[PDB]
Amino acid sequence: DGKLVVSKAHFGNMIRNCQSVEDFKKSFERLTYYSSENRESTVRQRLKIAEKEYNFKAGVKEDLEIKNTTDKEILDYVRNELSKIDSK
Amino acid sequence: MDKKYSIGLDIGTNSVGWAVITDEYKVPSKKFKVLGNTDRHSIKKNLIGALLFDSGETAEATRLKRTARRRYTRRKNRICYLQEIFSNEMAKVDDSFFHRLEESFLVEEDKKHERHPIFGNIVDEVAYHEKYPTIYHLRKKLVDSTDKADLRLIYLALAHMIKFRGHFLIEGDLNPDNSDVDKLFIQLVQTYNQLFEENPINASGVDAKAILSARLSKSRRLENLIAQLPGEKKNGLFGNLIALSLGLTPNFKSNFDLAEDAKLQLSKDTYDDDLDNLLAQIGDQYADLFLAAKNLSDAILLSDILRVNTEITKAPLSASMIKRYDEHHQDLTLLKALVRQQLPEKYKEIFFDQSKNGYAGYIDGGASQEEFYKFIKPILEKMDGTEELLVKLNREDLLRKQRTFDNGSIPHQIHLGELHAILRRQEDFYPFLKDNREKIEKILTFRIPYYVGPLARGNSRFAWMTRKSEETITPWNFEEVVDKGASAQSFIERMTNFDKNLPNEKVLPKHSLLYEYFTVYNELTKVKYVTEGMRKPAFLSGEQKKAIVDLLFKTNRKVTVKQLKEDYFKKIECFDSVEISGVEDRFNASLGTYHDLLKIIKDKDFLDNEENEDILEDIVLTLTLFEDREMIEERLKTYAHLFDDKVMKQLKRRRYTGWGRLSRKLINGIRDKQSGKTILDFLKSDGFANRNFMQLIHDDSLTFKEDIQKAQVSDSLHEHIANLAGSPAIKKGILQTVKVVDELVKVMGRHKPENIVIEMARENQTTQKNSRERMKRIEEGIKELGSQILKEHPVENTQLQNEKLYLYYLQNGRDMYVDQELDINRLSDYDVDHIVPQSFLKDDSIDNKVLTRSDKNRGKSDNVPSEEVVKKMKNYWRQLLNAKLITQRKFDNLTKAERGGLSELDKAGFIKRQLVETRQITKHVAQILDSRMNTKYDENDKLIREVKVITLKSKLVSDFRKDFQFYKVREINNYHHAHDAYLNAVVGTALIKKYPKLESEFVYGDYKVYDVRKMIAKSEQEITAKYFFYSNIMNFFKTEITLANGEIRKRPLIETNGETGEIVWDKGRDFATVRKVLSMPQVNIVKKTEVQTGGFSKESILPKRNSDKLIARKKDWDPKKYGGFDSPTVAYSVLVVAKVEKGKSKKLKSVKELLGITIMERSSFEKNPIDFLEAKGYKEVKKDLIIKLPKYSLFELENGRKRMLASAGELQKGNELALPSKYVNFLYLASHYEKLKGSPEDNEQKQLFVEQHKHYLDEIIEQISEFSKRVILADANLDKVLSAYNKHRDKPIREQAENIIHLFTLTNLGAPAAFKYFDTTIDRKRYTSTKEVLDATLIHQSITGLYETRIDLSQLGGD
RNA sequence: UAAAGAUGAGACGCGUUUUAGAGCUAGAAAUAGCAAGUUAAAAUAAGGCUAGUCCGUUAUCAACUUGAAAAAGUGGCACCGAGUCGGUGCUU
């Protein structure tokens, strides 16, 4: 329904490198991956992949001295969406 | 009204036959209830049957796929670590650089950013790709130059060095000791002379770097290096190791005199298992040799990649690859000019056509380098002006791509050197590179140890790592989060096997010192010697064993016999000449780790102190388990005061591999109760009859069988069948045997049987390979002698299939009992005689048989022959003895008259040979079934044995079938699996009731062993408390035992117990019973229905193609854009009754289809099947009628025609042919017309049987034809084979019968197969339509076939 | 004569797919002639949930009943026959 042509490995690669919350919302609303031949993955699966990747990018910049002023913004957005799913 | 029964079993890799007999040896019969919706409610079935199942495979390919997946995960993490270092200043240089590298896969229309990955406009991309045509131009520029470079180009160089980083085979730094060609060559000749101390290869002046590292061809470098050696063969072992190191294909056949070919090549990806297959043959001390050839191989390849000296650039690899690039450019320009100028018509197929192997097929087309060379070499030979390009083509240096397969020999210290030089050039301009420098270099060099494993957190069945803290493991905090002592202790507790004999005990390493003293005393305890004045050739006394092991196994590495005869016998004990028996020209054991550690420490007193055992055992254990330098440092801290630093640092570099199979407590820990000795004390000094290891476990005089027996207890059943030693096929056989016995006990009113007879036959006759040792055995045997038989009559391993001819050459063409020669032409008129007769033991072997001219030449003795041929042919048997053709056992059996007839010890030896099931897999099977049936305890905490369990030999039942004409043809039907199990239960129970004082020797359990010498009568007609004068235990089935001299002793027709008078065998009735059960029409053959698992399809990646029959390897990907799976595999099929839409009228036409579920879709189907089917175009699906149909689901059509479902659109034959037993004896006797293995009198009677019953062939053709017209139902092939039979009705019978056995492949069970009569190859008749099955009757069956549920499929779909 | 026997951990290099590396001239077009090519990025069973620097091709598996699942239950006996199992009493 107007979303691009990738898979799950490419889904995770292509939503890693966002630099704001609004860019992650746009690049999240443009991609999918089908979990089998006729069904699309649920939004909680895609948000859990984005949680894993901004957890990695959020946490490895703390093993270094690198200022992760974003990637804790995007990770908090991801975790609040996942909380709004799983509370319901 | 009988209630006692028995069970016969026979286990296989694809079959478990089974039976139930009662006390009169009759298979009973019962009316079984039938469930389902049909109008049949019961059927009689027999209690005989066979289960059939496909083989299990190993977890090896699953292992390899697993480890490749986790390597791709970890490589991708390396790239993300590096990007997360660069992202904060890269985010100032270019905001979308990581995005563009992240979406480069996409088509131009799909990308958000611009289509050029690195720079973003096209002018800078053409400029970038003109200045830097490869990545090595970029890498070399960043290493050399001093200008501030762009941050993108520094990321691209560091990412190309971190993603493709090299191997971790070399430890530490690169020095002349471990990476120059000449020092690896010196290590190869030191390892070589270490293996061959008799021939030291002198390499005093060989400049190996200048010879094996010159820009030459491989054969030219080989022949130059061999020519520099003083007097060596190019085709020797050393020339094969040097040519192995260069990269050719040497043949290791002529070095070790193997029967087959051994082509090893290092770039060939089967070098691992081919190397293991050679080390399974030629010994296992050659692994340091074939490893020291591989280290030289990567030294040669690495010094042939880096064709650039240092002190010009800091980057050798990059400048070397630009050199390769420019050579490609100038040879390509020269080749295009020489083809345009001379051969203009081949320019299109060299430089344009890519399906050929020209340059278009090399660059664009997917050919390798070698295919390109085989293509264009005759093109270059024709042309004029192609001298230099043929010089390069002979040298594998023509038109080289830079990412070749040879790049697997670059260490990571090259990439680390260039990495560090870039970070030191470019850090005055970028400060974060200076701060993060050691952190980037950690990303390259970090490597997870073997002893840590997957970095799991409680959710994998492969990992054991324990965490010192709860953080995420990165490369920069690995040695802070991982508890390495606890992880290493879990590693030792997991990777160390358990002892089979004495469980919960760990096996020693194979290079342990105690395992080496054990194997040396185990070899020295059975070596004999004969001396003039020592005419009874005894073993070695134990003090002689201690002196021989303290003078020879502690001086030399390998000990051949000449130092035993020279240094000990001729010098210490000072004889003149002593022959040594039991050892063949060299010992096979060695004290190798004693010499390794002795070379490292150089202190004899430390190794021989013998109170320093646990230190050295812990050293060899540490060097066996671990390969990490830092953990080997961490564990040998405690022994550091016993050594200096050079010996310590030299101990760290010595890795051993291999786990043995015997624990420490099994060698020194358990004791004999009578003597107070361990197994190693028996092997050092035993006394009179020095018994080795197996003769210590399997001796009832000693406590060892009691301790090992009582200690083998072992949990659940899958642990019992997981822990034991065997292939996964036979373990599937054992698990199905356990389930079969459980349901046979459930059938019989839950009464446990009197017996369970078990027999595990084999299918391992594969070759001919034993006939190579037959031919070679006559070669070495006659070449020992000096006779004139090989010259006048040459041997070959195709003529020696005749045993009269093999025995003709083995006896040097000479008659045994008469001093005469033998004609080779008249083997039809010569007799074969067993020395020890058949009435004492069944011995058809080559050890027992002697070829003679007249069978009555052996005198008149019903026992072993006389002593005239002993005293006359003594030196003849000496010449045949020393030729390694006849053995000392055969000479002793020929001289049993010289030692005064047979004794009762001899006969106890014959029963000892006949009874004992010596293998260990059957002994674990009887342990499992005995521990599973016999569970009850009495008052005294002993074990009441309700169920005896019996293991027989295979040759007992085989000789029963041969001697009483219950012949077996494996090709007619599958009933022989059932009939072998029935004959196990018959034979074993008749033996268990006939001789009840031999129950200690084939019933599993702790039984009172009785004096076998006292259960043997001394006179013939004596028979009171005796069992037999004739020691063949299978005589009492026979009515007429036959003496060797030519008499017939007739036994009584009713055999009873010799003590209690129970009637156990009646010859007038029980043969009629057995022959009546081996011809029943109904036998419960079952094929086990298995859901298919495995890979999702054929697993190659294909290009883009517009066919809609290709399911893509990803999801949104249109298969016309990328490509996909060629043929996906079906897990199981599903019968669906639903209404589909018929067409444009949108009608709800109800169909009943058969839909396969694939391995990819299987879990999606099992999640919600109504949603699954309904999204595939099935409205109105009923949940109660989805019927899972796995492979080999059985259906029944009309007229008793059955079909097994092979796949969702294919069927297989489901019926069996109960051919009458007279035709089966006719086919066996007819098609085995020569190979009869009996006397010519009764085999002449068998020739009268086939000749007087030649019309049985026509009646068999009537059987096959009527069965074929009822259920096989292939009319064209049946008329084709009736015509084919009519074209040959005058042929000999031994090929008409031998081809009717080929005709039964039409009427078998299973997949239809193409066979071949006299002339006609008949193609297979596939059943490609599953349309008739939807009206058939589905039969669900339990493992025995007896309880079944039959479903009427035509009553499904109506409403 | 008997006796490894399977199972597990770490790491390279290719290979294969897309995509980037400006195609030029003649021609309305088909087509023809010429140029060039060696490398890189990403993916590497589909995917999964516990989100690990983990798991995803082994072993296990008739049907029905109770169970979330490891699991536990469900099927009279005896004689005379035998073409894939029939007939005959006996308690039901």
Side-chain angles (χ1 to χ4, degrees), chain B residues 933-941 943-948:
Chain B
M933 293 293 111
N934 292 317
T935 60
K936 295 293 185 183
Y937 286 156
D938 53 354
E939 296 180 355
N940 304 115
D941 288 334
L943 188 64
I944 294 172
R945 292 194 185 277
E946 301 177 355
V947 176
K948 289 186 179 179

Side-chain angles (χ1 to χ4, degrees), chain B residues 877-910:
Chain B
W877 297 348
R878 180 67 62 192
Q879 290 179 355
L880 290 179
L881 181 63
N882 295 116
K884 286 188 182 293
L885 298 180
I886 73 168
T887 185
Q888 191 62 256
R889 183 185 178 274
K890 183 179 179 177
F891 180 76
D892 284 332
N893 293 319
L894 285 165
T895 60
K896 294 300 292 181
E898 188 175 4
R899 279 86 53 84
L902 288 179
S903 70
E904 299 178 353
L905 191 277
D906 300 328
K907 293 185 180 180
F910 289 158

Side-chain angles (χ1 to χ4, degrees), chain B residues 600 644 647-648 650-651 653:
Chain B
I600 295 174
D644 203 357
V647 51
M648 179 64 200
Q650 195 173 3
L651 277 176
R653 290 183 178 90

Side-chain angles (χ1 to χ4, degrees), chain B residues 250-264:
Chain B
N251 192 357
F252 291 94
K253 183 175 184 177
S254 180
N255 304 120
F256 300 100
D257 294 332
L258 297 172
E260 296 174 353
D261 54 351
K263 287 189 179 181
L264 294 177

Side-chain angles (χ1 to χ4, degrees), chain B residues 1293 1295-1305:
Chain B
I1293 306 169
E1295 283 186 354
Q1296 293 184 358
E1298 191 176 0
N1299 290 318
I1300 288 172
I1301 293 171
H1302 290 171
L1303 289 173
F1304 288 103
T1305 65

